[PDB]
Amino acid sequence: SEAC
Amino acid sequence: MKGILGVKVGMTRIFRDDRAVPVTVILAGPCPVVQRRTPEKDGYTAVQLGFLPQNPKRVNRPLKGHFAKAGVEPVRILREIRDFNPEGDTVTVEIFKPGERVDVTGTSKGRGFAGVMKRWNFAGGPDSHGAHKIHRHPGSIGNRKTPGRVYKGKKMAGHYGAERVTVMNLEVVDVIPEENLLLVKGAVPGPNGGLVIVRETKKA
Amino acid sequence: SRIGRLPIPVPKGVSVEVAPGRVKVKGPKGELEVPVSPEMRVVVEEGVVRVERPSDERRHKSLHGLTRTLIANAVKGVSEGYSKELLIKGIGYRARLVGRALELTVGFSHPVVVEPPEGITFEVPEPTRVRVSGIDKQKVGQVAANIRAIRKPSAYHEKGIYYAGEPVRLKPGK
């Protein structure tokens, strides 16, 4: 995940 | 409704009115009748047919008793043709005339364990542009938490061919009574030497 | 104001018998049979048939009127008979009999051959008039309706199959  | 047990021989093309006609040659008869299914006894109408003589020293006692009630030689194969009560006790290629349409049932060629591309004509994945070891893979098999499962009858990999296949409405090109030969325009299921069942057509 | 209390005149010599939920009408041209509600009462008098309803509830009043006309239509059918006439119209439209069957020439690429059911007799006086004849009133009307349907009156022109007595109403075109 790179939930930005 | 009428039928006969055959052997697939091979393919060729003959010439009829300056046209090339691909054919499959079938060694149909002769099929002696071994037993008759009646509505009084069994509940339906059919003929049990014999095909190919067999080494009498190869057919056990239960089967020999069966052949004796009909007074016939040992035959290699026994198959029923439903809704057919022929007059005689023997069925030969001459129940068909050239110009009639027939259906033929054989056992297709067996591909063993077949991938989804050969089994179901799937499209695979790309062969470049980053594709990462999915070149022949089925893709996605579902959705997410709803329904959270995989449909029955989902197209996947697995065994293929060596299954009963009927092709329907083939034109009988010629009949050669002297050799028990039956000619049929087009392609018939299975390999040369495979057993096939030839029936009068059902398409009107 | 009441159909079902109107007595039914019966001509000489027509037979009328009463049965459970049935009555049978035997006359000069044959015999019909009218199925009646058990809730009604068919009573035979001197050359007269009457129908009596048990209460004044709406189902009894509705079967009452219905039932009287059913008996009367059958008794007229076995004596006098029923018929319906059709006028064909058009520049190329005509018809003829072929045996007992009815062949129509009415503008298709083919003719249309109508066969008469049991109890129905066809007849073509002139190539443009057709008559349906039988004892059963409802059946004579169904046969006539079917024949008409094959080529209905045109909305804009006076061609098609018309009931005798049917008005010719048309609308313009430009």
């Binding site: - | 093309r13 010439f15 300056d18 046209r19 090339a20 | -």
Partner: protein, 122 residues
């Protein structure tokens, strides 16, 4: 076996020298055109002052194919190029001459004028 992107030589004196098929006018989604089929195409090369110029979207009928077409007598025929003749919406040739042999299939498909202008029907 002509499909979109396929280049075709021009077997006539219309002025066009090469055309690029853009559509197979045979149904909703024919994959391939053969002999006797009509395509839509773009003129990619012309000779000057011809009846057609570069950048024209025209009609044409395929008269020769490198993929060999088969026949009911069991024979087949195969040409060295892929060639077509430019037509108008009445299937008639828009030029006055037809260069090279054409297939006999064009006759059945109703392109009789091209066939007669052809120097050899094979």
């Amino acid at each position: 076996m002509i499909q979109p992107q396929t280049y075709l030589e021009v077997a006539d004196n219309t002025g066009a020298r090469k055309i690029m098929c853009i559509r197979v006018l045979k149904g909703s989604n024919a994959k391939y055109a053969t002999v006797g089929d009509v395509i839509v195409a773009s003129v990619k090369e012309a000779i000057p002052r011809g009846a057609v110029k570069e950048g024209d979207v025209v009609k044409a009928v395929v008269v020769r194919t490198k993929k060999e077409i088969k026949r009911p007598d069991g024979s087949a025929i195969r040409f060295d190029d892929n060639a077509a003749v430019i037509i108008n919406n009445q299937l008639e040739p828009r030029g006055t001459r037809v260069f090279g042999p054409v297939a006999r299939e064009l006759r059945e498909k109703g392109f009789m004028k091209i066939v007669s202008l052809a120097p050899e029907v094979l």
